[PDB]
Design a protein around this ligand. Sequence first.
Ligand SMILES: CCCN1CC[C@H](CSc2ccc([C@@H]3c4ccc(O)cc4CC4(CC4)N3C(=O)c3ccccc3)cc2)C1
Ligand SMILES: CCCN1CC[C@H](CSc2ccc([C@@H]3c4ccc(O)cc4CC4(CC4)N3C(=O)c3ccccc3)cc2)C1
Lengths: 208, 218
Amino acid sequence: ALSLTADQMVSALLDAEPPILYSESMMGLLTNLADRELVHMINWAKRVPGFVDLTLHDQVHLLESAWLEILMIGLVWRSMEHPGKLLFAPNLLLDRNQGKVEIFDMLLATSSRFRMMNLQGEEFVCLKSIILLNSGVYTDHIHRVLDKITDTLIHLMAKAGLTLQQQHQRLAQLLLILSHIRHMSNKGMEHLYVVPSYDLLLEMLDAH
Amino acid sequence: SLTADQMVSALLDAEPPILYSEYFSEASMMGLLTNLADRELVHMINWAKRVPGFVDLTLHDQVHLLESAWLEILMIGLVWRSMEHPGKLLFAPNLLLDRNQVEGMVEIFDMLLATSSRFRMMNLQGEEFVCLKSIILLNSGVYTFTLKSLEEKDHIHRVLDKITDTLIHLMAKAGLTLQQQHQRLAQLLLILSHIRHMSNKGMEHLYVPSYDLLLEML
Ligand SMILES: CCCN1CC[C@H](CSc2ccc([C@@H]3c4ccc(O)cc4CC4(CC4)N3C(=O)c3ccccc3)cc2)C1
Ligand SMILES: CCCN1CC[C@H](CSc2ccc([C@@H]3c4ccc(O)cc4CC4(CC4)N3C(=O)c3ccccc3)cc2)C1
């Protein structure tokens, strides 16, 4: 799994992207959307190179720690080309006045930062994979997979013609946004208080 | 226009002192810890004013950054002081606690010990530590802030890019390959995500310096 080249890493992550779901009272709608997204997030996670080499127990615990950050970065990515709004679904585009908002504004600020940086889709899927592997790690294989996502990000920035200086500056800019995504997830849990159970996540993993 | 070497030296020179507790009971512990944190906050203000680029910001923005970052900064300082003492948190040289020494305190205690362990595994260097602490100051509040606010953010990101350049410089100096430099840069910056996590958890557990207090010292 660690033998993939950088381009093969990118290709695998792009191929594993989950579909964009539609909405089926605001907060029942958004909860139900999140619930349906979580199954597709599990299928995605199983395709992040290195993830399924962990025990099922450690897979579940990484998902327990990461699932809200992953929903949020996906939302921010979708909303990136809709200034001042959040595209929860293609049939569910909300502005902040429908938000009444503190967390809404943080998400909008993240999407605008992504817009400023002209975040690329190949960079997005790497960041999402880092969240998966990193959010639960504090609580050797995981670190080896994280290092090769770093190698892959740097490879993408070199391919785009950035200087070596610009590469490390951009790498750092992107990883600092992950601190803000963590902050939003923490404030989001406080607001939503919700957590998918160990057994629910385990069932969606569909063990052999 | 500071070089990386000048950035490192300025940050090392700005380091606050390690403070002591007064010269044990569980019942007085939180009072001692709060008194220590209060005294450290005064020195943290002086340190912040010496982080290159910080005092170029408006007073209002300086307060907002410190408002967002002060707990993360106390926490990373504690983890650094604790790094050579496995299983312990060295709040002060005369206040060294283990995890057996309040509801929800041990959960945060454990996250801090895990950060200390991570520092040891990576053999974190003092020059890297001071860079990380300056990044926290400039970054933690930069997504929760007019033409003046756009100029401020620009400056903050230019200072952050300089610190990235400085970290890479330090790592290259230590003989790391270029792959190893990027890998370690990422490893260090991902630690900042965990420090943010502990700050949010800590705020929940502690429930704070006022703007006027921060403005008065600033
Ligand atoms: C078994 C039941 C457990 N399920 C139920 C709990 C657990 C799910 S709870 C839950 C999770 C997510 C949301 C949505 C939602 C939905 C889809 C998506 O892609 C993103 C978001 C973003 C956001 C999380 C911040 N959100 C809000 O509503 C929000 C947005 C901006 C400001 C404030 C609140 C809503 C509810 C799993
Ligand atoms: C008038 C403004 C009020 N002042 C404004 C600053 C003051 C704010 S409150 C406050 C801040 C800090 C702590 C200490 C403390 C002290 C010094 C230090 O270097 C680090 C720490 C770490 C830690 C914060 C997590 N802590 C705990 O006790 C703790 C530790 C592990 C698990 C759980 C709790 C304690 C209280 C109050």
